[PDB]
C-alpha cells in the first residue's frame, strides 16, 4: 500500500525516457538507471515497505518502460528498455540482499 513509491519509480522512468530522447548514450542511460534504482529501493527500505510492494515497484518500472518506448524513436526506446530491465535487476538483487 504505497502508490507514492510507484509513482516516484514511474517518474524516474520518465527521466530516463528524457535522457534517451535527448540522445544520451547507452552507458550513461545505465550509469542512472543504477542510480535511481538504489534511490527507489531507499524508499522500499525506509518505509519498511514489503516484498509485494517491491514486486509492484518492479512491475510498474517494466510497464513505464514499454509506455514511454512508444514516445522514441526505434534506437532510443531500445536504449530505454534496456536501462529498465537493469533498474529491475538492481531493485531485485537488492531485496535479496535485504534478506
Do not use: C, T
Not at 515497484?57 to 528498455?81: C, G, H, I, S, T
Not at 533498474?87 to 540482499?97: D, N
Amino acid at each position: 500500500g504505497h502508490p507514492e513509491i510507484v509513482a516516484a519509480a514511474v517518474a524516474f522512468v520518465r527521466q530516463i525516457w528524457e535522457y534517451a530522447r535527448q540522445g544520451m548514450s547507452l552507458d550513461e542511460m545505465i550509469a542512472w538507471a543504477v542510480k535511481y534504482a538504489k534511490k527507489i529501493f531507499d524508499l522500499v527500505k525506509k518505509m519498511g515497505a514489503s516484498d509485494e510492494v517491491l514486486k509492484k515497484v518492479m512491475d510498474a518500472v517494466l510497464a513505464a518502460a514499454q509506455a514511454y518506448a512508444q514516445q522514441l524513436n526505434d534506437e532510443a526506446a531500445q536504449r530505454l528498455l534496456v536501462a529498465a530491465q537493469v533498474i529491475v535487476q538492481v531493485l531485485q538483487q537488492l531485496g535479496l540482499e535485504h534478506h
